[PDB]
Design a protein around this nucleic acid. Structure first.
Ligand SMILES: Nc1ncnc2c1ncn2[C@H]1C[C@H](O)[C@@H](COP(=O)(O)CP(=O)(O)OP(=O)(O)O)O1
Ligand SMILES: [Cl-]
Ligand SMILES: [Mg+2]
Ligand SMILES: [Mn+2]
Ligand code: NA
Ligand code: NA
Length: 315
DNA sequence: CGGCTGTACTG
DNA sequence: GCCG
DNA sequence: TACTG
DNA sequence: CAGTA
């Protein structure tokens, strides 16, 4: 962690991101990670250009920060940016929505609350604005997972319940709880949610689909905060690909999916497929065929990769 | 030049 | 923004 | 119980 | 969270 040139660069990345330049923001993201994991502080332009993810433009910015301790770009960042960031931290509102609100003269959450027309998701996002920005301690994630497990167990179906996401990767704090539920390959979802809602445990629903639920829960007692809860239900046949997907991290999933693509394969939460047919844009023409993947290890093996424990997937 | 993951949900 |  | 899928 | 040992 030997490079606080990244603190200035992170400012630019978020600015680009909220203003909608997604790929330039991606470029900075990668450059920032590269510098974060570099063993030593970077003193050199040729040393800088040695790092994958750091090109001439990035290198020029490294040299400028070393020379002046400042970044000329940061000073010229649009004054709309802090407001765009405030708005896009509302769950359900992204860059397009934040920009529209800003164009329309909104400047604070008070403005949004009184004059803005919110979708149902954004209204819930706004009501829990601060809570959605907080991470919980690992132990509280445990209690939430166990609450879902007990509800699932009570149906005496074949339900298996596993906590994924950052929890399964062993993190000390969690932004939400991501729970995977599997049923024998042979309405279960809706009954379960009804159980959790009857207990007073589920307090708001953001998304309810056939495959995924995203919502808000709160444990009993004083000093409790509303916490985000994601639940996915998949057939047992898809277990390993679903566990791999939901375990992440997002960056890890993207790298592994990118590798699969170079191999003429495709990886999603449903399956690993081979002999996939893609056009000149890398867009899928035809689906190829599904490879058997009984465990996570099989996916790595079929990709020609060494296994990584969830702890080693946090990227 | 042009990709940078691949899916689900909403209205 | 970077890189193939 | 400690771990996998 | 059911199964494995
Ligand atoms: N953009 C993306 N592309 C592909 N896969 C993605 C993804 N975003 C999330 N995922 C997958 C992996 C996450 O670990 C998992 C949960 O996504 P998440 O939004 O809960 C982030 P997590 O890794 O759990 O950390 P935390 O902040 O919640 O504590 O879903
Ligand atoms: Cl997916
Ligand atoms: Mg999570
Ligand atoms: Mn989540
Ligand atoms: Na480089
Ligand atoms: Na948002």
């Amino acid at each position: 962690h030997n490079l606080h040139i990244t603190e200035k660069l992170e400012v630019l990345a978020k600015a680009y991101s909220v203003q909608g330049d997604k790929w330039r923001a991606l470029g900075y993201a990668k450059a920032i990670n590269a510098l974060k994991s570099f063993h030593k502080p970077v003193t050199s332009y040729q040393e800088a250009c040695s790092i994958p993810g750091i090109g001439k433009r990035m290198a020029e910015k490294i040299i400028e920060i070393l020379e002046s301790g400042h970044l000329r770009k940061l000073d010229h960042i649009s004054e709309s940016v802090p407001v765009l960031e405030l708005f896009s931290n509302i769950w359900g509102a992204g860059t397009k929505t934040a920009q529209m609100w800003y164009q329309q003269g909104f400047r604070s959450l008070e403005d949004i609350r009184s004059q803005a027309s919110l979708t149902t998701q954004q209204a819930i996002g706004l009501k829990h604005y601060s809570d959605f920005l907080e991470r919980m301690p690992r132990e509280e994630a445990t209690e939430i997972e166990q609450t879902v497990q007990k509800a699932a167990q009570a149906f005496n179906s074949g339900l298996l319940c596993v906590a994924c996401g950052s929890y399964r990767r062993g993190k000390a704090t969690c932004g939400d709880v991501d729970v995977l539920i599997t049923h024998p390959d042979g309405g279960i979802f809706s009954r379960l949610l009804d159980s959790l809602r009857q207990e007073g445990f589920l307090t708001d629903d953001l998304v309810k689909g056939e495959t995924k639920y995203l919502g808000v829960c709160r444990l009993p007692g004083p000093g409790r905060r509303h916490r985000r809860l994601d639940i996915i239900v998949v057939p047992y046949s898809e277990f390993a690909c679903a566990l791999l997907y939901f375990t992440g991290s997002a960056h890890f999933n993207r790298s592994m999916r990118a590798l699969a693509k170079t191999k003429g394969m495709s990886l999603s939460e449903h399956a690993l497929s081979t002999a996939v047919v893609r056009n000149t844009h890398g867009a899928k023409v035809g689906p190829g065929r599904v490879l058997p993947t009984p465990t996570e290890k099989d996916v790595f093996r079929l990709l020609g990769l060494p296994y990584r424990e969830p702890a080693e997937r946090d990227w």
